[PDB]
Amino acid sequence: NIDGYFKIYSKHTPINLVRDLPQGFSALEPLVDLPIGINITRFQTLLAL
Amino acid sequence: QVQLVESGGGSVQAGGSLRLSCAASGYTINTDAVAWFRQAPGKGDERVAVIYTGSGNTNYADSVKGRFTISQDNAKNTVYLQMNSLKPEDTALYYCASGYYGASGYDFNNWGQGTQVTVS
Amino acid sequence: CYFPLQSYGFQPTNGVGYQPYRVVVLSFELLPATVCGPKKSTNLVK
Amino acid sequence: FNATRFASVYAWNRKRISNCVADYSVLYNSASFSTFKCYGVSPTKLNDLCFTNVYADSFVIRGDEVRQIAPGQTGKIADYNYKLPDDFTGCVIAWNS
Ligand SMILES: *[C@@H]1O[C@H](CO)[C@@H](O)[C@H](O)[C@H]1NC(C)=O
């Protein structure tokens, strides 16, 4: 969240682990640049049950 | 005390020319500004051009600029509209109005029966 | 005690001054700009 | 513009426009409008300006009252029905209906 732009970079990779967050390298590429310009200090995730 | 009579209309081909006359009678000295306006049946009033008799300044609708020219002959006491490169959009009744001052569209009055121009 | 507002009552035979007119005022507010312009183009030569 | 229903002059309807692109060239070069008064910016070269928001205030009046809609003017409609800021940056469009 910078210059009033919310910048979201994403990327995505098949894994065969059981419980960990792999090692390795992978460069994220930008996905969107929302021109919102709000004041973000906290966030939460939201997931399905 | 002021009368305006329009004449010079008719039927012309696209790209043709017509020359419309506004002859004024009475004591027209007070009316410094003269305007030509047209109305098609369906549509509302529009001012094609206006002239200031004393100064000579003129105004034109964006559509008519280049094709229409407004002039006056003081001896004739007439204001003339020259229509060149006539277009089908030009088809409507034409009238001339007159007013003391140019701030508003109403103070112009005294417009006559008008003239019909049809472009086909 | 009089009613504040009055009706125009437009008719087909209205005069040019009294004929109805639609008016729209577009005000531009700037303080990230969101609405931009069209900035035309040309052909490519190599 | 082409909207069928307009509110009263005292009940002027307001709309907000953002997150889009505006081509004012088509509006300016239309010949169907008898009122084109842009204050603050030139009527042309509007395609080179980008703003955060646009506010459209639409209403209907009679022709004799089209004059009072401008900065620094006084009148019945302006004073009692629709008063506009003196130093606004925008443009007023209008046409016989
Ligand atoms: C809105 O008005 C313009 C000019 O008066 C006209 O050319 C245009 O076709 C209209 N829009 C629609 C969607 O009909």
The domains of chain B, with CATH numbers, are 2-119 (2.60.40.10)
D44 lines ligand 1 (CB under 6 A): no
Instruction: Using the atom order of ligand 1, give the atom closest to the CA of residue D95.
Output: 5
Rounded distance between C-alpha atoms, residue B3 and residue B25, angstroms: 5
Question: Which residue is closest in CA terms to ligand 1's atom 7?
Answer: D30
> Resolution of the coordinates in A?
3.6
Give CA angle at B108 (D85, B87), nearest 5°.
95
Q: In this complex, do D53 and C34 lie within 8 Å of one another by their Cβ atoms? A: yes
Tell me whether C29 touches chain A (CB under 8 Å): no
Burial of D53 (0-12, 13-18, 19+ CB in 10 A): middle
Taking the CB of residue D69, how many other CB atoms lie within 10 A of it?
A: 21
User: Pick from D78, B49, D44: which is nearest to C25 by CA?
Assistant: D78
Distance (Å) from CA D53 to ligand 1 centroid: 24
User: Pick from B58, B80, B104: which is nearest to B4 by CA?
Assistant: B80
The kind and range of the H/E element at D27 are helix D24-28
Q: In this complex, do B62 and D31 lie within 8 Å of one another by their Cβ atoms? A: yes
Rounded distance between C-alpha atoms, residue B38 and residue B53, angstroms: 20
Q: In this complex, do B44 and C17 lie within 8 Å of one another by their Cβ atoms? A: no
Distance (Å) from CA B85 to ligand 1 centroid: 25
